[PDB]
Design a protein around this ligand. Structure first.
Ligand SMILES: NC(=O)c1c[n+]([C@@H]2O[C@H](COP(=O)([O-])OP(=O)(O)OC[C@H]3O[C@@H](n4cnc5c(N)ncnc54)[C@H](O)[C@@H]3O)[C@@H](O)[C@H]2O)ccc1[C@@H]1CCCCC1=O
Ligand SMILES: NC(=O)c1c[n+]([C@@H]2O[C@H](COP(=O)([O-])OP(=O)(O)OC[C@H]3O[C@@H](n4cnc5c(N)ncnc54)[C@H](O)[C@@H]3O)[C@@H](O)[C@H]2O)ccc1[C@@H]1CCCCC1=O
Ligand SMILES: [Ca+2]
Ligand SMILES: [Ca+2]
Lengths: 254, 254
């Protein structure tokens, strides 16, 4: 995929991983880069524009926990402006296992709903042009951090959902792949709520081990987008990009 | 695990798989069998009691989409009656990918919330005695039916969540394992809503291939409970019981 002159919507572009990905995206000379996020960040937007003034950068406030009809309304506004969208990147996430409902609503339901909404515009069965979805999941969707079991289970859900989208591309015209960071250091310093406080020190304990920077992650993220491989399960860990082979434990035969 | 004289709570005991499991459970001569389900079924309750009159069978109306505080209140009522509970079986599920929010609420959030609520009574850190949780997930949590991607993703979530619970048993005193049916024929005749109607004939197409009966499933379900293996990922497919080895793609190192 050559990102030059493409139109990209990125939900949650302005977070720790998001902003370093966005810096690399705008270097790739997009036509339009449309950032949807829960809170404004006007300085980040200006930083991005300064990297490549040719890119048209727009922002819309967006909370992925709104109903699907509300997402459709916002997407309509964007499609009526841009006419075409080439790639949707769904990057929203929280980690807080004291917030069970909200974890699931943001990390899983909200990603499914944004996806369902954009299919109104893209599905080839309704006369749409098809499209490409990149979902930020997590290595915890392969193997949990069991001390944050709700977070990890929410990410297993979207790893699954993304695999399924990719298998539906012959029907819908929409391809998809997952982007699964390992532990990635950003400008922020975190502490996490574990489920029922089984482990108050998850952030500290993770950082005892080798990790990667958000710059490394962001570089490999854009490399994965450029590879444009339907059904890939990309691991972005320890500064490398690696496609994972999903184990076949069971087959529906359909 | 010898189920004689044990106290078992079974959420969703009266469905297609549930009722055939329940028939085998009561043959195992439980002390108390407490059935929580969304709708009453007085004839089923009487059938069960007739299999083994020695078992004390009680019923409570329960919808897994209520808030965790409401689940705690009901569990308190049960613990104050029984004093001890040996095993919780979480079996609620729907399949309807036109109902995205409700699929996730029942299949994933609700199972997590019932689990979180019973940990108030069992967690060894609060002076509780520990316990055992059996979660009905699905083979689709290993490999999706991609035509029902929301259902399948909800089941990947609870396969993950259950693996994580099992790894927390040293902290909480609560062990856990997943029960993952393959395609299982019950007394009901179904048709399914696929996501965005990608495939209107999922039920018919599944049944083209080898399947198993709910009696076979129920027999292997009780066999898995009797094995009492923390962290097992049980596949109940084609009439057999098989533990699955989960692939290690990534390690947190914590
Ligand atoms: N930084 C990491 O190491 C990491 C990050 N993730 C995921 O990568 C994505 C970006 O994470 P981050 O940059 O590290 O975090 P950060 O908190 O900096 O960014 C969160 C982004 O999501 C946005 N957001 C949150 N809630 C909403 C909402 N309701 N509506 C719309 N937008 C919302 C928010 O505004 C921001 O753009 C999230 O999905 C993370 O869960 C995946 C893997 C790892 C995680 C790290 C934690 C332990 C386990 C891991 O595997
Ligand atoms: N029968 C199967 O072949 C099968 C069944 N499951 C799961 O096994 C469990 C039992 O399914 P079943 O007996 O086939 O279905 P059935 O519809 O007969 O039973 C559903 C049970 O969940 C209960 N329930 C539903 N909503 C609620 C709620 N809000 N609150 C409390 N209880 C509720 C309901 O009252 C009933 O006891 C569910 O979790 C299923 O998702 C797992 C695997 C397979 C599925 C079959 C469909 C395609 C993909 C497969 O892998
Ligand atoms: Ca270029
Ligand atoms: Ca016995």
């Amino acid at each position: 995929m050559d990102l030059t002159n493409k139109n990209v919507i990125f939900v949650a572009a302005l977070g720790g991983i998001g902003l370093d990905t966005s810096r690399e995206l705008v270097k790739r000379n997009l036509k339009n880069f449309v950032i949807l996020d829960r809170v404004e960040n006007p300085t980040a937007l200006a930083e991005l524009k300064a990297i490549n003034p040719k890119v048209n950068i727009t922002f819309h406030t967006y909370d992925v926990t709104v109903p699907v009809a509300e997402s459709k309304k916002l997407l309509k506004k964007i499609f009526d402006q841009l006419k075409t969208v080439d790639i949707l990147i769904n990057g929203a996430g929280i980690l807080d296992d004291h917030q069970i409902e909200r974890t699931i609503a943001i990390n899983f339901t909200g990603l499914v709903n944004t996806t369902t909404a954009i299919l109104d515009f893209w599905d080839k069965r309704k006369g749409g042009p098809g499209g490409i979805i990149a979902n930020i999941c997590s290595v915890t969707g392969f193997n949990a951090i069991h001390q944050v079991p709700v977070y990890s289970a929410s990410k297993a859900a979207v790893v699954s959902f993304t695999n399924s989208l990719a298998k539906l591309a012959p029907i819908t015209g929409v391809t998809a792949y997952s982007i699964n960071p390992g532990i990635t250091r950003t400008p922020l310093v975190h502490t996490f709520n574990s489920w029922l406080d089984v482990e108050p020190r998850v952030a500290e304990l993770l950082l005892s081990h080798p990790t990667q920077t958000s710059e490394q992650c962001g570089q490999n993220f854009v490399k994965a987008i450029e590879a444009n491989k339907n059904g890939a399960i990309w691991k972005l860990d320890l500064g490398t990009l690696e496609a994972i082979e999903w184990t076949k434990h069971w087959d529906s035969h359909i």
